[model samples]
Target: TTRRLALFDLDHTLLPLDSDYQWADFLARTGRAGDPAEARRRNDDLMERYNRGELTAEQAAEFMLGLLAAHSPVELAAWHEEFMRDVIRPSLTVQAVDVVRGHLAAGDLCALVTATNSFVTAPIARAFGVQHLIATDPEYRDGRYTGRIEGTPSFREGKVVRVNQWLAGMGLALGDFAESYFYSDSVNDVPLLEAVTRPIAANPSPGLREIAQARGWQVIDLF
Candidate 1:
């Protein structure tokens, strides 16, 4: 039998909130990030732009990845555990878990394809029982983060590029799968959503919802 693939977008699709955004807020709240008010203001601005599909991967990484570069890996590890506990775990809905579990139970190859850097989304992926994660890589040098992205970011069109590269490395190609599904909530995911056989709009933003309607894609609410 031909293989099947199920890809998920993390923020706002699988999880109720944006992990990247919340992580920044969490830092600011705990005073780990300097100037809570300034950090929050910037965070809100970025989120607004992100919702409009106007934020570039470079712009996003400048602030979002900067959080990763702020602390040592050891410190980050502890903070992230707290993040998952306080922010992510509470937001994980039963509907989302059931949807992911359905795909896993069917034996489909599953991956979390997100623009958020691995440092933030990797643990979230594991929480959902997903073994594969294709996310932007944060640069690290000599055991410290360089506050830079290493390669093609899994954002917008880059998601398609990264997914292709990932499949190639797995000794499989996109066409190798008889069925492929991509679930997302943003217009930023248009490229990968279009590439997949089945595109699901999961609690999509206005832009994506309009496009999904025009394309006759399935719309679902996992919240």
Candidate 2:
């Protein structure tokens, strides 16, 4: 029998909230990001562009990754633990857990493929029982974050590239799977969505919803 593959997007797809967005908001709220008002305004602006599918990984990294560069890894680690407790833990709904668990129970090769940097998402992936995570890498040097992306970001078309690279590393290919599923909420995920055998629009954005509807793709509400 051929192997089965299950890929999931973070943020609005599995979790009700965008982890990256909330992380920024958390920093702003706690006054760790300097001026709260200005930080929030900029965050909102970036999110607006993101929602419109206009934001690039480079653009997002300018501020989002900058958060990591601003503090020592130890400080960020403490803050993130708090973030996971206060923000992420409460949002890990039963529905979301069940969806991911269902795939794991089936013995599929499961992974969380997200645009969020690994620094912010690795623990969340662990919480979901996912073993693999393909996320944008944050540069580290001299025991501190450089806030620079290391390689191809797992965003937009980069997701497909990263996923394929991951498969290749395992001596497998996407086509080696009898079934492949990618669940996402953003139009930006269209490339990877198209690459999979099963493309599910999980609480998709307006643009993705319309595309999914037109294509007769499966639409699910995980919230």
Candidate 3:
């Protein structure tokens, strides 16, 4: 039996853009997320902190998920439709899709592993045709988002925890696979990149690029 596991990081790795960043920007531009200036400023701050690996899940939720709290599921869903069509669809690069397809066609167990919340990435996972998604959970209550995280965020070392949980749920583990591959572009994911059998530095950040070079990991400038 062939058993291969492939995990793709969203944001800068699989897609050419950051979904959270774009989602906030989408709301700002559309006048849904309050003042464009303040919204964009907050999003920019979070994104920069995210890149530096300084952003905590709680900090991210203060603004990113709060936007979810501000709107009902219906309104969010409607906005996401236009967001997907205008932003995500156009930003989708050929290389990213091709790489994902390669693993998918090979019958590898594929999943999208992201630090962003599921609300923002679920549709993205479907678009990529990956049935499994491991992302930060957004808490919801009283028929609305609570702007809080329900469980561990799939960020940094939490990625490993979530991946382990996912595997266990399937009565399998990382070692059960013949080969495990994780595609990432940030040093923030060094923990996950190191956890997999194959660590691909796709569109690597300056920090991750150096680490990959020294570690002798495969590098691809996807997108």
Candidate 4:
């Protein structure tokens, strides 16, 4: 039986930069996402609504997932290689890496649960040496992504749902573990944060920070 379960959010938790946003920026800058200026502008526009709570995860994913549909997995993989080196690697900090290292060393059941599509974050989780990744998966058919979400997105409350399912895959449940930890930087992850035995607000946003402090949660500053 797993004694401890550790879940970390990707975005501003494990990395200083948001990998999903940067992936689009990388594609836009490289001319793979369409007109460089327009693509970059559009990317920000989507977030404008999401930031304001006007758009749902699926709505926001529409544009981001569309970027994947335009190319094959093989090609996307190749571009992702360059992306890892130029973008994510530099933003990956020693503090973030050590947190993961400790959990791994302790033999905890660890996973990175992010709303970012698996197409993007899968490699990232691997680079961080995480054993499992529970990210939103993009729909793929035949040879390419269908520009839609595969199933339940690992966003907001969906994160808790997905985590439960992931644990089920190993024949366990949240309560089965002696202690469960969920670390995140966004207020959006409060659902999972609340569900865990140890809820850590790592590099939290203003909203998350206030909630964390008020609730007596552990606040870790990874930067």
Candidate 5:
């Protein structure tokens, strides 16, 4: 029996540009984000830089931690869960979820691999009915969120490493998969894009467009 794999990058691939940022901004606007006004200011800056391609994944972590640091773990998780149910899922395109479900129905092993912190991305993974997530680790202390990363931030080449390590856990290797597919929209995902047998540029960035054209990979924009 052969096992095929479908690895998806969450941000632009599954949903959109980091819904966690939008959730944080929502909290900040509601005065629940720590330091209310200050947190709002920082989140706004994060969104601006991220949209302009001036922000890095490491910077995104720092920005998210700033908000997480303001609340206890319980509060943060509770808020995040509510946000996931109420706001995040509603904004996503039904077509994206359908694409993922189609792969799952075909018996492909689907994994949500992202550079965003797991704390924020976990619920998103579940929403998409995905059971596995490879993302940045958020530190915890005394069973509470610590607003810090416990290890190297997962992005760029790190995404490739984490995805391979995860596959190894299943007694498999990247080369063992019948057809390894990865979908992403950002240039930061080039390492991952290169790792897969089939690299799909979904709603690609300018850099990704160039890479897709050069490699003769499929470039699609469904949103």
Candidate 6:
């Protein structure tokens, strides 16, 4: 059978908003996030504005870059693994995990396409038993994070590009899939959502609700 691919946007679609941000905050609050006051201050501000609905994606990138920039890749990977195992996984809703697993059990090829860095999303992907994850590739050289994303940022239109490339890599085009499904929450996912055969607005913001309703897509709240 031709595969039905289910591409999930990580942050809001699966485990709710900005698990990476929360993971960083947990590390900082517990005095484990290194002793860089400037980075800590910026992360704190980013979280505050995000919670208040005032932070834009660009703002998020700035703060995320600040956090990744200070770490060696080895250290970042190790810390992120521990964070995922001990902190992030517990915060995930059981229903979200079950939903993803059910899709996999139905013989769908499940992939995670998120704007978050591979450093963080990789562990979460493994936790979901998904072998394929497309995320912003943070460049590393000499074992240190270069603080720059390789290729594209994997947000907005970049997501569409990366997803198509992933499809091509599978020796299948988007059209070849039984039905392509995309589940996302933000306006930033508009381009990616448009490319899918079935677009699900999961836990959408007001803007996405307007777009989803006009497109006649399914809108559901896992929260």
The global C-alpha lDDT for each of the candidates, from Candidate 1 onward, is: 0.91, 0.92, 0.91, 0.93, 0.83, 0.82
**Per-residue lDDT of candidate 2, residues 1-223 (tens digit):** 6679999999999999989889999998887888999889888988789668898659877679988888989999999999999999999889989989999999999999999999999999999999999999898999988879988899999999999999999898998999999999999899999999999999999999999999999999887
Over the stretch 1-223, how does candidate 4's per-residue lDDT look in tens digits?
6579999999999998888899999999998988999998988899998889999768898778999999999999999999999999988889999999999899898999999999899889999899799999999999999899988999999999999999999899999988999999998899999999999999999999999999999999999
Q: Pick the candidate with the highest lDDT.
A: 4
Q: What is the per-residue lDDT of model 1 for residues 2-105, given as tens digits with 9 covering 90 to 100?
A: 77999999999998888887899999887688898987887888878976889865977877888878789999999999999999999999999988999999
Enumerate residue pairs that collide in model 4.
none
Error of 3 at 122 (Å): 0.4
For model 4 the TM-score comes to: 0.96
- Per-residue alpha-carbon lDDT of candidate 5 for residues 1-223, written as tens digits (9 for 90 to 100): 5878999888877886666667687788767965788978878778789879898767778778667777888887788878887778786788789979988998999999887788888888898999999998878778766777777667899989888888899888888878989999999889898889999999899998998999899987858
Model 1, global lDDT: 0.91
* Segments in model 3 whose C-alpha atoms lie over 4 Å from true places: 45-57
Query: By TM-score, who's the top model here?
Result: 4
lDDT of 1 at 155: 92
lDDT, residue 29, model 3: 85
Candidate 2: 10-residue stretch with minimal lDDT: 55-64
Ten-residue stretch with the least lDDT total in model 5? 16-25
| Pairs of residues at least 3 apart in sequence or in different chains that clash in candidate 2 | none
